[PDB]
Amino acid sequence: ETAFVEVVLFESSPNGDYKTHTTELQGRFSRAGATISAEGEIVQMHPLGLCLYEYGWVGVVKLEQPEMDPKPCLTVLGKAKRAVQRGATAVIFDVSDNPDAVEQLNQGLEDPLKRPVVYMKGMDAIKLMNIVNKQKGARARIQHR
Amino acid sequence: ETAFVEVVLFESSPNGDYKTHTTELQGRFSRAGATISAEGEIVQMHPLGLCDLYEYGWVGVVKLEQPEMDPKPCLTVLGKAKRAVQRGATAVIFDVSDNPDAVEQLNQGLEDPLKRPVVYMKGMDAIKLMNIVNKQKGARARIQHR
């Protein structure tokens, strides 16, 4: 099922009102996690960063070439789990560089997380990084329709 | 339609992890805002307080006054919802227990709906909501369309 991800940039206009810009993106809900909507501020994690942020962040993790990390500290599902335990309301992996991560997550072996675990690639990941990379405050609204 | 609201208390466990306690509550989405999901930190707002910056993305909770308490209200209850979004609310949850007439007003159809959810809660759920909000600091609201 498709995860409709809205990524919102924001600047507090001087008087308290917010100026925002929204970009709508898409990934899929993995079997590894729940298929629910979720939302919160984006934290960009390095994939090795998962071996205190305020509760309810949306982890964004750009996975790396499998041959960069030969004996990885955890499985990609393990990494997501650790994120949640550390207060993530959702995890979005950019699997552009680790396309086999997908089959690994959808392997349906452990029963799922109660939070979403979304995978993104191609154009949408590029845009997700285009935004994340440049702006401190960005918000993710992950929507199951 | 029903708004399925999970309120989550939380505090850090001594090792980086979070200990949490979750409470599932219900309200309805009103025609004044979308019927979508939304999540964020609760900010309890006095109803007269929509007439100081908050981190974008908060879920405002507003317990409405007995109508005879506010004779000259700065805004319609939809106006306060709308003002809250503009100040970075991701959703508004009104406790309507003391002002049941606000429901009919919120569902009026007259103005465009907000792109954010505007939920109302009453009776028991709202009690349970304020029970958590008034005591607990560090409360996250997850509002869910199913």
Side-chain angles (χ1 to χ4, degrees), chain A residues 7-18 20-51 53-70 72-135:
Chain A
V7 176
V8 181
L9 286 176
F10 65 95
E11 306 102 63
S12 70
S13 301
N15 69 103
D17 300 331
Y18 275 98
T20 70
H21 175 287
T22 75
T23 300
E24 160 77 59
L25 303 177
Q26 299 191 3
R28 322 269 103 74
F29 292 100
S30 77
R31 204 169 304 168
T35 301
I36 45 176
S37 289
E39 166 189 22
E41 156 158 56
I42 292 163
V43 169
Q44 162 156 21
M45 287 275 352
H46 193 276
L48 304 155
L50 288 149
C51 329
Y53 290 103
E54 164 94 24
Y55 190 83
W57 47 285
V58 166
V60 166
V61 181
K62 176 164 184 53
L63 296 196
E64 56 191 352
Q65 214 76 57
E67 77 269 8
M68 293 287 99
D69 205 3
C73 64
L74 288 175
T75 60
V76 62
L77 208 175
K79 286 181 197 282
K81 231 142 202 308
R82 197 45 221 153
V84 167
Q85 282 173 353
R86 301 169 49 173
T89 184
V91 186
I92 296 170
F93 291 107
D94 163 10
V95 292
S96 296
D97 296 352
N98 192 351
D100 296 351
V102 182
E103 320 187 26
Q104 293 229 281
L105 290 165
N106 284 327
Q107 263 340 59
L109 293 152
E110 303 97 311
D111 56 353
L113 294 176
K114 297 210 215 306
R115 310 306 316 160
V117 176
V118 164
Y119 55 85
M120 210 145 295
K121 57 155 156 285
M123 263 197 41
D124 291 281
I126 290 158
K127 296 210 269 202
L128 175 64
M129 305 316 296
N130 278 159
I131 296 160
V132 173
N133 269 337
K134 300 179 173 165
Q135 338 297 1

Side-chain angles (χ1 to χ4, degrees), chain B residues 50-71 73-107 109 111-113:
Chain B
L50 286 141
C51 319
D52 273 11
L53 199 93
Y54 286 113
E55 279 201 335
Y56 187 81
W58 45 286
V59 161
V61 158
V62 191
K63 174 152 181 66
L64 303 173
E65 311 242 65
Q66 207 75 54
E68 68 267 30
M69 286 282 92
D70 194 1
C74 60
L75 289 178
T76 53
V77 69
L78 185 43
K80 292 149 187 266
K82 216 160 195 313
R83 187 77 205 113
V85 167
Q86 275 172 359
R87 297 156 61 170
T90 197
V92 182
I93 298 188
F94 290 103
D95 174 4
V96 294
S97 303
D98 296 347
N99 187 23
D101 293 344
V103 176
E104 296 169 22
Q105 300 199 7
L106 283 164
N107 300 322
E111 283 101 49
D112 283 61

Side-chain angles (χ1 to χ4, degrees), chain B residues 20-71 73-74:
Chain B
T20 62
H21 177 108
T22 292
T23 315
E24 161 77 52
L25 301 177
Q26 312 208 341
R28 312 257 108 67
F29 297 90
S30 58
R31 200 203 299 256
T35 292
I36 60 165
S37 275
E39 159 186 6
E41 187 176 29
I42 280 150
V43 166
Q44 181 169 12
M45 179 83 79
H46 192 285
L48 288 179
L50 286 141
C51 319
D52 273 11
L53 199 93
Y54 286 113
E55 279 201 335
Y56 187 81
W58 45 286
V59 161
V61 158
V62 191
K63 174 152 181 66
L64 303 173
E65 311 242 65
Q66 207 75 54
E68 68 267 30
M69 286 282 92
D70 194 1
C74 60

